[PDB]
Design a protein around this ligand. Sequence first.
Ligand SMILES: [Zn+2]
Length: 194
Amino acid sequence: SVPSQKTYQGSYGFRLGFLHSGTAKSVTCTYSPALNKMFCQLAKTCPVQLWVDSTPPPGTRVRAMAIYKQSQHMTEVVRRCPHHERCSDSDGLAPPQHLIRVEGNLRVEYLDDRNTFRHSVVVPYEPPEVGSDCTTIHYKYMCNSSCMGGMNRRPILTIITLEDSSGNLLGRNSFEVRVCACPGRDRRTEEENL
Ligand SMILES: [Zn+2]
């Protein structure tokens, strides 16, 4: 019982983009092309860019979902650790257990799948204005990679799916995530092994 991670550009040429932020000590969020991996800080904005060759129909929705990267952990549902789950950091919209939030969107919607028990967060797709090339969604990870009782140092992927108003699949892309203190340092260090 594991959700697909196969890349699928679909009819609209769906692709993911990121800020080219570098690895200076102070950066809150930074992406590695070589690793296909996002490094970001706990509860900080992590911008993900949606790129399309053609504008998807109105009613299109954008869902984000987390799964564990290692195959022997994939069936386990990724959720916040007991401490954070119990934390007073609610924004009034996100369920307390949910790892991934979206900020600054009053039309945000959260799901507990009645059959898989997996969490996900979905927002209406917005087209870029004619002077921009992509759409930006501001994600937040609400639990650390090192949190004991949660992910517990196990690496995760985020799966972004493009779907119509009826929930049918239009596109899919994914990237690995590490939530940590000092993404800049951890990115340079992990990239050094190459
Ligand atoms: Zn936690």
